[PDB]
């Protein structure tokens, strides 16, 4: 997002947390 | 708050840094 | 848990995400 | 899964590692 | 790739940063 | 403390490892 | 930032990655 | 052990934290 | 300093953050 | 290797995974 | 480097370990 | 070391950064 933040992936159902630009 | 974020709590007697959702 | 974890904390509402042993 | 673990996602191109809740 | 990398996601979009082996 | 030691908390209890400025 | 953010520097160049407050 | 995990190493010495798969 | 630490650099203007050995 | 990588050690028993400079 | 990488700075003398794209 | 840092393993000859608690 510049940062990088952790964050729940809102695209799909399997509790997914990634890196965000 | 979802992200991650490495924030400073609210408690004064060792000031904790915790992560807030 | 030994291993450490980042784990929601049940105990308040404010999002807290500490380490877990 | 709560806590956030280290895992291989299900997906054979470029294997990847994602945070799981 | 072994190593786990901290890389952006494939398509050039997204603007994911995953663990890659 | 400055720096951001990662350390468990006080009360030998909770099991809780947080950010210790 | 108080929160600590991972960003890229000023400047536009370095490429360096470090902690924001 | 998949996922990796951030334990700490056999022996009950060294007092070392790794991954383990 | 070996051991990585979490400390603010000395630098007034955007306060770093920076891993000190 | 500098830089630091998370990689697999060379064990066979409990496979570990530690970073390399 | 895209991946980010925990890298000594070789750009001064206070063993500074940052983020590199 | 309670509190956990990243450093220099000094027990051998492959840049092994480990956990230390």
């Given amino acids: ?3 990088v ?3 729940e992936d809102v ?3 399997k ?3 990634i ?3």
Avoid: D, H, R, T
């Fill in 11 to 13: 695209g799909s159902n």
């Fill in 5 to 7: 933040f952790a964050c």
């Fill in 1 to 3: 997002v510049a940062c």
């Fill in 15 to 17: 509790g997914a947390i």
């Fill in 19 to 21: 890196g965000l630009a």
